[PDB]
Amino acid sequence: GPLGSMEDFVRQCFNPMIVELAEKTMKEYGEDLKIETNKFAAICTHLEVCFMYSDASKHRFEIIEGRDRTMAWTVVNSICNTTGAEKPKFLPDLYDYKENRFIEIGVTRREVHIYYLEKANKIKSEKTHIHIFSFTGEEMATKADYTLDEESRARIKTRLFTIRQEMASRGLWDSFRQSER
Ligand SMILES: O=Cc1cc(Cc2ccccc2Cl)cc([N+](=O)[O-])c1O
Ligand SMILES: O=Cc1cc(Cc2ccccc2Cl)cc([N+](=O)[O-])c1O
Ligand SMILES: [Mn+2]
After folding, report:
1. 145 catalytically annotated
2. Which domains does the chain possess?
3. How many CA atoms lie within 13 Å of 76's alpha carbon, on the beta-carbon side?
4. Which ligand places an atom closest to the C-alpha of 64?
5. Could you say which DSSP state residue 132 is in?
């Protein structure tokens, strides 16, 4: 069976903007995308999911994730002073102007409940809302509040399913599925 390059897949499957933001994220975290290709893919995936989440209800969400750290932190600070929200330890992904809370998105090849627990413990914030997607359609949100309607989340799930099927047809899926730390 023919086995493809993950880097190739990423550059063909993801938006050049997304790929660039992922590239810069890997830059500023001291890791080589040419070696950690699965990670390149995961960061691209997370980015696309955050963007789709925001795009699901335009002008409701503030995007924190896409920006470079310094800009993202200025944006977070601004949101905090303007709204009165608790400043997070971590860069969250979104801000919900409707529900008045920061949102952390997660995308996992693992079991979503465990991943949710690890994410929650990793952020140490009782005010931040957590939403976890898997590639298999399963999801897990804070206090069973899934924020978006079934259709939007189905759009996201369909995208994830497609990414997985295209990974698998290139033989890339197994290494990716099992390389999650
Ligand atoms: O699993 C959580 C997770 C969080 C992040 C973001 C992150 C990285 C360091 C500290 C907190 C947070 Cl939220 C990044 C990655 N990653 O590149 O695989 C993660 O796997
Ligand atoms: O898996 C990649 C990944 C990337 C990000 C983006 C990111 C956010 C903050 C710091 C580092 C990075 Cl790579 C976030 C999460 N996350 O919150 O679970 C991720 O799982
Ligand atoms: Mn983040």
Report:
1. no
2. 1-181 (3.40.91.90)
3. 22
4. 3
5. E
